[model samples]
Target: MTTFHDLPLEERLTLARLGTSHYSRQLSLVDNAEFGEHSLLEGWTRSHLIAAVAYNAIALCNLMHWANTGEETPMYVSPEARNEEIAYGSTLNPDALRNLHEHSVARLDVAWRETSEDAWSHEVLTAQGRTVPASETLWMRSREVWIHAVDLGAVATFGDIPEVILRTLAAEITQKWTSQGAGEGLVLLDEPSSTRYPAAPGQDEVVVSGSLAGIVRYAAGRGSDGVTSSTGEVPEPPRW
Candidate 1:
């Protein structure tokens, strides 16, 4: 698979725009009454999920500003502030929430558009403390919008996400799990591609096989509904 950094800037930006549009359409169909319903995310309601996505765009915009100016503009003041922002945003009325989503996306889009090409190479620290180039923001937002759209319990599903994105997500999840020693002896087989990502050492090797979308959805800690394992029971994936 092609590394994310190796992908063209235009391709990454295009996927990001498509994900935003897809998420917006899903959000449009959601009724205010359903905002309190539980989302696929363990403890978050649909409103919380939406708010998180919106606030994330705002945070990324901060990074973009930092990149453009070569200044220190952290994604958030503190972890507590980030949680509080999402909590506050989640309490907003449906109409206000929808508007906030649109406005936040617009703000981030403007930041990306106005940033000069040279600024794309500027280093910025993510909220998680990872230092990455400004260009990483595009992929970060792309993954969030697309995957969280499915979490909304709307019309979107894992299968609706692009294959390239799913494949990459599967690889990323496997890598993280292996590094943490949580995926020991668990091999992921991309059935369509006939490729395998070997797991960490120890235990009997368990091969989990499925379509790219199914594999990614399971790996993301959503569920193993579509994937099957050699042992007849799919092993629970670690938290993402």
Candidate 2:
């Protein structure tokens, strides 16, 4: 059972670097004409995906500031402002979009690198209203870059993600579903280990079995082709 506490600062830094590298590589390969192509996300183009990832880094910097100064700094000025930024960013030219991503990545990297060891324990609030320590920023940024890279409709895929990250993501999705009463009577079976993650209590439990990567893809609302359910019908995962 790997927990967030088990991840040292160096490991988190390494993952962050790897994620950014993958995302940047994908960004470089995208042509200007492909920017308007539909991404995996419904109703969102590749441009929107890139814009969201870019701005997400900027928003997370506010949390870093909160950690470093012990002052309350929200991730965004307001929800509307955040959405507007993404909308505006989607309109940028290819060169401008790339520049934004590069600058944001550099700024975020410096913020993480300059954070003192002691300051990692300082509390901060997520935009979702959850109170978490400053260290949470690393995983938060890591997840966004890596996942959105795949969503960019470029070369990245779920199989490219680390096994540790996939397992952690599966756990998170399972937990979210359980909390919302959305995954009742559902069990996720990891075929590689034959490990079973049972569902929230309910009748007629259905066992959905697959590789860790496949399970994560399905849970992420990507697809269900790689997974199989005991009921012979894989239920749609709730919106993440």
* Per-residue error (Å), model 1, residue 111: 0.5
For residue 152, model 1's alpha carbon misses the true position, in angstroms, by 0.6
Q: Per-residue CA lDDT of candidate 2, range 183-240, in tens?
A: 7888888998887766576888888899988888888888998799999999986778
- Taking all chains together, each candidate's TM-score versus the true structure is 0.96, 0.96
- Which whole-number lDDT from 0 to 100 does residue 200 have in model 1? 69
CA RMSD of each candidate after superposition = 1.3, 1.2
Model 1 ranges with Cα > 4 A deviation: none
List, residue by residue over 33-80, the lDDT tens digit for candidate 1. 999889878999989999999999999999999999999999999999
Worst 10 residues of 1 by lDDT: 194-203
For candidate 2, what's the RMSD?
A: 1.2
CA lDDT, every model vs. true structure? 0.88, 0.85
User: For each predicted model, how many residue pairs clash, with residues at least 3 apart or on different chains?
Assistant: 0, 0
